Design a protein around this ligand. Structure first.
Ligand SMILES: CC(=O)N[C@H]1/C(=N/OC(=O)Nc2ccccc2)O[C@H](CO)[C@@H](O)[C@@H]1O
Ligand SMILES: CC(=O)N[C@H]1/C(=N/OC(=O)Nc2ccccc2)O[C@H](CO)[C@@H](O)[C@@H]1O
Lengths: 408, 408
């Protein structure tokens, strides 16, 4: 069935906040249990929390030694938030995690975010001797965003992505380069307008070729990822921002994680425009968002009850900003975020979100056969087998009737 | 139940195209059958197809005689499209239609559109001696939109709305003043930007206080409608366009028919902003749109199969441009339109749309008790009664099992 063949993805922000391999395996088990197909794991998102064994970087006519890069990144991340739970996943842990997921039929999609949400990398680059990597807006320095005029900072960042992409090659299918929310701290969430401004309002102090350079940067990352046999993904907001096609084009192989329909003064391209350009669309509707430590109404945007309500009200098939058109999607992604990374991670709350997303879109999620397997095993060792292995969660109680056997 | 208490509305464009009282009663019967609560009947929308017995209008220090107004409007409408099926509903027919609907528990919501989509009224005003009522944009004259600088044209239009509102008083609850798509012909669908332009780009030939005057106009119509005990409704696109609150405010009693999340260069306010301003929201998602004579993919926007797919993919609870927030709604409205008014009206196609909207949102629509009543009557005259009169279409087959009795 076509619905069941879609991707159903849970997203976890292990960039801002540390998650242990054990916690992540537990998430993987629940994902499999509920009919999900993939774990989307941000490891670079403000913080950078995945260290390769060899972190040496060649860029700028030199090689930054592995030990030096590791030190700079570890500290860069800790300056953002020194998490008492841990700093980073190691390469051994990631290889094991990917294999553990794969053995269960769960794929892994990493994110290493740039040119925004890269606090730790910027911090690292500074320690390594790269001057003024940060974008500044009229005196206000972005903590999270690289200046695209800074050739050395850009070359280092590209080489770091390439290094990660070389690792994830053959172990994974998709690599999310991110691209969301350029200089959102320094511009009060007006980054794309700011990058486009100089073209239409010249000689006013706006970044010359700002957006043009962003386009070139995004496409170069896309080529880098694809050179390792990987499909690039990115968040939608900066992609043909304001529906403006006059700055250049985006590479069609960029899968768009469509998370926002925009807001006042933040006029993103519709998913209709993006799909018509040829981009595949992953529905990542922010109606479903959950930010750790926000549980009920009044606790702010992305609170759990808001996310659970978005899940109930806005199904997997309902994409942001469609113009009423029929947008084809590769599937849908529900996202948990750690904006305040010191908040306590609650497995039960995350699984409640995941369960609700699966149950509210039951025809899209493979039925739970684990329960049935478990029951057969619990039969003293001294229907179920014949029911087709292709039901959805919508037909779940069928299976739960066959487990209601128990006696004989 | 809260879901069942929502409004579920079918919209019919009897402004562009003539619909007979008989056709409309048939629509009302189907609406009741499927669990709808209201018929939204545009009678002024490009064409004007409802004539009051007394059409005399006092404005501009004079009274335009009823017979003169009737002649001008009838011709104005025919110049738009002289429909061989008929020109207008009469007052007797409308009073009967409203009563017929009311007796069945179906409300009627009329639309008389302005200051856009008012071809016939503009045509009429010209015949009646009002000079240059039409908005022009750099030489290009709008056929559909009144110039808000034209005091006499504005005063006549306001008085016509007041006349209709006086008629609909006590017979109805809501009056839709429309307000969609200002000068969409003459500006290539850029009307709101055009009205706002002079404020930010002065001395360039843009309408001085264009949007400011639109705001005053909308609010005056709102006061007029409310003076007859009616709640005003309007389409969302012109309401705080571009999320700009610096031109003035909209009256909070304006219920917003939220039909569009906007598109490239057409940056409407989010339903989040509108709801936070205090506006009640009627979900009128254009994903569900059906334009008569467009049946399959490739036949253009609003084709039937597109509407049926929008209905399947986007439920009644999914509002345009929410910013991911929980938007409260008074209910939802599915709309059939006659953009090409010479297209053949197909009852079966319209009922298919209506049926699908009801079945795709089954928990919102009152169950069909008419079938059960019919069966009891067909019992030779020489369970059903006890099942609660409060089920939704989701529990329909319960009732259809009780009708599967038939024999004894
Ligand atoms: C692509 C994305 O979601 N980026 C940021 C992001 N941006 O969201 C907004 O700018 N606004 C918003 C916040 C909560 C829910 C919906 C939209 O949302 C997440 C939750 O706050 C952040 O953790 C992400 O880093
Ligand atoms: C409020 C509204 O819908 N206005 C016009 C309207 N505006 O729609 C658009 O501008 N674009 C559009 C067309 C079809 C489906 C969705 C959006 O849609 C209807 C169907 O074309 C027209 O009949 C209406 O007059």
């Amino acid at each position: 069935n076509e619905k069941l063949a879609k991707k159903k993805i849970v997203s976890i922000d292990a960039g801002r906040k540390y998650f242990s391999p054990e916690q992540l395996k537990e998430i993987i088990d629940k994902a499999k249990h509920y009919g999900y197909t993939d774990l989307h794991l941000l490891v670079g998102n403000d913080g950078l929390r995945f260290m390769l064994d060899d972190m040496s970087i060649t860029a700028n006519g030199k090689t930054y030694a592995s030990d030096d890069v590791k030190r700079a990144i570890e500290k860069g991340t800790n300056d953002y938030y020194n998490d008492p739970n841990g700093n980073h996943l190691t390469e051994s842990q990631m290889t094991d995690l990917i294999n553990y997921a794969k053995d269960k039929g769960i794929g892994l999609i990493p994110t290493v975010n740039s040119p925004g949400h890269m606090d730790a990398i910027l911090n690292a680059m500074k320690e390594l001797g790269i001057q003024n990597p940060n974008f500044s807006y009229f005196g206000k320095k972005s903590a999270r965003t690289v200046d695209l005029d800074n050739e050395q900072a850009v070359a280092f960042t590209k080489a770091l992505i390439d290094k990660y992409a070389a690792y994830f090659a053959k172990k994974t299918e998709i690599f999310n380069i991110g691209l969301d929310e350029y200089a959102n701290d320094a511009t009060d969430a007006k980054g794309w307008s700011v990058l486009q401004a100089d073209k239409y309002y010249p000689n006013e102090g706006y970044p010359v070729k700002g957006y043009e350079k962003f386009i070139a940067y995004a496409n170069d990352l896309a080529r880098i990822v694809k050179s390792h046999g990987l499909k690039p993904m990115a968040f939608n907001d900066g992609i043909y921002y304001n529906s403006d096609t006059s700055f250049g084009s985006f590479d069609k192989d960029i899968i768009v994680s469509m998370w926002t329909g925009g807001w006042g003064g933040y006029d993103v391209a519709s998913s209709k425009l993006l799909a018509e350009k040829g981009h595949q669309i992953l529905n990542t509707n922010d109606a479903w968002y959950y930010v750790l430590g926000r549980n009920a109404d009044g606790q702010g945007g992305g609170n759990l009850d808001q996310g659970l309500n978005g899940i109930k009200n806005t199904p997997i098939t309902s994409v942001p900003k469609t113009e009423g058109a029929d947008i084809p999607i590769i599937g849908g992604m529900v996202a948990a975020w750690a904006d305040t990374p010191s908040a306590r991670y609650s497995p039960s709350r995350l699984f409640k979100l995941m369960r609700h997303f699966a149950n509210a879109n039951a025809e899209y999620f493979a039925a739970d056969y684990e329960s049935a397997e478990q029951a057969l095993n619990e039969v003293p060792k001294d229907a179920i087998r014949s029911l087709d292995s292709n039901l959805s969660r919508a037909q779940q109680d069928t299976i739960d009737q066959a487990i209601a056997k128990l006696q004989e």
